[PDB]
Amino acid sequence: TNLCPFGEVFNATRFASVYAWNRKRISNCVADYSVLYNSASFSTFKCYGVSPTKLNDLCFTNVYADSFVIRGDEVRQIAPGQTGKIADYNYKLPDDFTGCVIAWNSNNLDSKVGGNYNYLYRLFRKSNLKPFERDISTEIYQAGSTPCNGVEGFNCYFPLQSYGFQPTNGVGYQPYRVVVLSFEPATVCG
Amino acid sequence: DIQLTQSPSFLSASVGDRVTITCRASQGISSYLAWYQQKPGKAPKLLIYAASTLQSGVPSRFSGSGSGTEFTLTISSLQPEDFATYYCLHLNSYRTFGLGTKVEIKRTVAAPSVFIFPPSDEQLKSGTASVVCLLNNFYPREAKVQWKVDNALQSGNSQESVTEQDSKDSTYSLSSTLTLSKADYEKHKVYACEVTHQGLSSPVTKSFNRGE
Amino acid sequence: EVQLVESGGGLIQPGGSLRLSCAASGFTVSSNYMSWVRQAPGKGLEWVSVIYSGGSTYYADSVKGRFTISRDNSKNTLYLQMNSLRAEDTAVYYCARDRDYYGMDVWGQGTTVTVSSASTKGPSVFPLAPSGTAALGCLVKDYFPEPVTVSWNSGALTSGVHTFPAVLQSSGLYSLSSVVTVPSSSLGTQTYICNVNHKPSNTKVDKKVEP
Ligand SMILES: *[C@@H]1O[C@H](CO)[C@@H](O)[C@H](O)[C@H]1NC(C)=O
Numbered sequence: 001t002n003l004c005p006f007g008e009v010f011n012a013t014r015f016a017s018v019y020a021w022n023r024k025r026i027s028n029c030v031a032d033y034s035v036l037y038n039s040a041s042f043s044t045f046k047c048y049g050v051s052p053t054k055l056n057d058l059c060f061t062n063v064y065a066d067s068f069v070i071r072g073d074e075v076r077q078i079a080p081g082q083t084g085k086i087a088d089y090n091y092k093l094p095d096d097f098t099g100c101v102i103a104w105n106s107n108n109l110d111s112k113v114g115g116n117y118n119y120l121y122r123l124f125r126k127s128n129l130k131p132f133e134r135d136i137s138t139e140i141y142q143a144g145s146t147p148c149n150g151v152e153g154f155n156c157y158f159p160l161q162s163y164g165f166q167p168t169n170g171v172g173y174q175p176y177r178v179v180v181l182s183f184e185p186a187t188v189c190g
Numbered sequence: 191d192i193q194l195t196q197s198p199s200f201l202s203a204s205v206g207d208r209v210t211i212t213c214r215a216s217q218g219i220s221s222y223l224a225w226y227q228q229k230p231g232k233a234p235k236l237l238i239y240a241a242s243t244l245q246s247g248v249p250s251r252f253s254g255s256g257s258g259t260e261f262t263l264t265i266s267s268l269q270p271e272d273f274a275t276y277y278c279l280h281l282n283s284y285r286t287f288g289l290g291t292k293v294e295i296k297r298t299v300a301a302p303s304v305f306i307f308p309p310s311d312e313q314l315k316s317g318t319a320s321v322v323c324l325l326n327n328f329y330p331r332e333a334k335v336q337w338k339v340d341n342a343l344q345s346g347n348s349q350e351s352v353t354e355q356d357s358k359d360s361t362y363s364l365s366s367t368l369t370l371s372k373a374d375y376e377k378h379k380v381y382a383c384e385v386t387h388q389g390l391s392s393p394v395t396k397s398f399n400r401g402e
Numbered sequence: 403e404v405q406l407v408e409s410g411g412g413l414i415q416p417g418g419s420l421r422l423s424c425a426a427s428g429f430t431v432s433s434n435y436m437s438w439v440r441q442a443p444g445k446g447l448e449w450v451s452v453i454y455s456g457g458s459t460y461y462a463d464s465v466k467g468r469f470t471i472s473r474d475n476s477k478n479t480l481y482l483q484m485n486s487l488r489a490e491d492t493a494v495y496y497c498a499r500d501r502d503y504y505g506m507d508v509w510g511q512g513t514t515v516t517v518s519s520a521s522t523k524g525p526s527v528f529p530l531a532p533s534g535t536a537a538l539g540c541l542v543k544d545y546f547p548e549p550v551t552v553s554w555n556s557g558a559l560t561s562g563v564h565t566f567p568a569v570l571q572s573s574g575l576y577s578l579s580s581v582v583t584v585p586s587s588s589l590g591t592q593t594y595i596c597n598v599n600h601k602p603s604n605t606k607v608d609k610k611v612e613p
Binding site for chain 1: 428429430433434454455456457458501502503504
Binding site: 085115164165166169170171173 | 192215218219220222258282
């Protein structure tokens with residue numbers, strides 16, 4: 001009989017950096033997703049497994065809600081089969097993804113005059129992430145043959161960079177909050 | 191599609207001056223901008239990245255500054271080896287360079303000396319006529335060659351090129367070629383080029399009559 | 403040391419294909435972002451293509467579908483495969499190590515690609531005959547490919563010489579002018595010869611220029 005706590009993920013006051021994206025596990029509750037989809041407050045609401053107005057009518061063993069912040073131009077990377085710094089190095093959806101991608105502009109909350117430098121993303125990585133891999137490493141990146149031994153320098157880079165979110169950014173460079181719902185003995189139903 | 195516009199395309203200055211080059215983005219792009227220097231016949235060099243970060247080993251007189259929509263590159267006291275072209279660049283899943291800013295040596299205005307050359311009899315035998323107009327040792331760069339043929343203003347049948355600033359007097363020279371078939375060249379008398387330039391009070395015309 | 407050396411550029415016809423190579427030292431190509439940047443004669447830098455250390459690739463619209471960037475880790479070498487070439491693809495091609503947010507810090511010296519239907523041909527040299535400063539010169543017309551060298555009186559005359567950038571005519575051939583200004587008093591007493599050398603065609607021309 002109990003309601004899935006989608007509010008505390010969508011309405012959380014603080015969101016994770018994309019490289020350290022948060023995962024919430026929705027289990028043992030009832031979910032009304034047409035209330036999310038009827039919100040009409042999301043610039044992105046693309047579902048990949050089955051119709052969004054037709055998903056209040058199904059059951060799943062486990063629902064995962066992943067959430068993070070990225071820049072606007074990068075929201076398109078949060079979809080199956082994409083490439084780029086986010087999809088390759090930060091958060092990677094599988095090619096056979098079934099689920100929904102929801103996003104909205106968060107310029108009012110996550111940008112600051114002077115620039116908000118708290119949101120970070122992974123800039124350097126030797127190889128692409130597997131689907132749903134979370135790399136929280138801050139080891140210095142070795143771009144040449146000499147080991148870095150924890151010292152930044154030539155061929156030795158800190159692997160993370162911060163988005164400088166300012167409210168005068170173009171919308172492509174403004175912060176967007178993203179929630180990814182993936183659908184995995186039923187525990188959650190409509 | 192964010193468009194970068196760099197300005198000015200040409201900047202004249204002298205050793206010791208403070209020069210300011212601007213790059214304007216059609217939308218706020220935060221710090222996603224870098225500046226490069228290129229000397230003729232040589233590879234680019236990185237100067238500044240992330241808008242205001244000076245690349246290692248680059249002289250401290252170079253500095254960058256940016257809001258998101260307006261970026262400037264400032265050379266605090268111009269050195270002789272800073273005469274070069276400068277390009278701003280914007281990035282993210284692509285890289286886009288600005289058109290560039292050429293920093294040139296300032297000097298006093300100098301009028302061109304103008305010469306016109308008729309086609310040689312040898313070239314005519316082959317069926318084409320090349321008329322050449324020379325503008326020698328002038329400053330500044332901007333000049334207008336207007337070819338006139340029997341007082342009809344010519345358009346679409348000329349090409350020109352300009353030298354680099356001369357190493358001793360910092361002037362330019364310009365050469366403009368007007369190309370006609372022999373038959374067309376034989377169906378006209380007075381060939382002239384009229385030159386407009388800041389160092390001339392009125393335009394100067396050099397001309398010749400075909401076959402005199 | 404740190405080095406990028408780009409080779410493979412040469413002359414090729416429209417529609418043809420060409421592979422450029424960029425051999426690196428002092429960093430690991432497959433560990434880095436890597437770019438190709440080019441510069442057409444007398445024009446600005448144009449970014450061409452980028453490869454991410456993880457293998458993603460991106461292209462400027464003007465080469466999309468025609469160029470392919472790639473690398474070979476065992477040779478620490480970066481490649482640009484260029485198909486369906488066009489005349490406007492004529493440029494010096496550079497590779498750079500690309501630090502993304504941090505910019506491209508290491509560059510090659512560049513390699514030259516020339517795309518053209520034209521076939522090799524030595525210039526015709528015509529006098530630019532003079533009419534206390536006089537002007538005379540040589541018109542070095544209808545050659546291909548670049549470059550030509552011009553000198554005056556076998557190097558003995560250098561003051562007052564301007565040799566102008568070549569122009570590319572609609573015929574696909576190049577044309578250039580070289581001039582010198584001299585005292586008009588010397589027009590009757592000094593011989594002036596221009597020495598035109600076009601090695602690609604192995605052509606040398608000396609042309610006396612008189613009133
Ligand atoms: C977030 O808060 C608003 C305001 O109370 C509420 O209307 C909305 O339903 C909340 N979002 C979710 C997903 O519960």
